[PDB]
Ligand binder design. Sequence first.
Ligand code: A1BPJ
Ligand code: ZN
Length: 140
Amino acid sequence: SGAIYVGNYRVVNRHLATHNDWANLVWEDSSRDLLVSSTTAQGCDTIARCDCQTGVYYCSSRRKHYPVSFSKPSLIFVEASEYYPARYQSHLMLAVGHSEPGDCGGILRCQHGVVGIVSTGGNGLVGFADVRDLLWLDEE
Ligand SMILES: Cc1ccc2c(C(=O)NCCc3cocn3)c[nH]c2c1
Ligand SMILES: [Zn+2]
């Protein structure tokens, strides 16, 4: 589990969105595994605006933050999980690291701010849904 809280927005994995998220929906995209809902309070996270390929992510199944090198956001085939059938997921970055299903939502950050959240993974992999192209998260 986990979310990004920027401005009056809450960014979560679409497959972990709650009824309150869906009742206060701003934007969602199944192909990216992302959903954004509105919040009453303002958040503290800042979004990175960059092309970094190195950063640090939180792994809840280890209670640890790990430094990683990651690929640029791309369209990558992803195998079935409990939330989606095997399918192409867009705007996805891969790194070598540990990821179990409940690790979804952990933040990946670089020197500029938040880069994305955990969504995919397995056999020494972990995939992140990028948010650096969502420029509207910085306004309204
Ligand atoms: C071993 C293993 C198995 C499953 C996962 C996993 C997961 O279930 N969430 C994916 C949400 C999703 C995107 O695409 C498909 N399903 C995240 N890390 C894992 C690691
Ligand atoms: Zn950066």
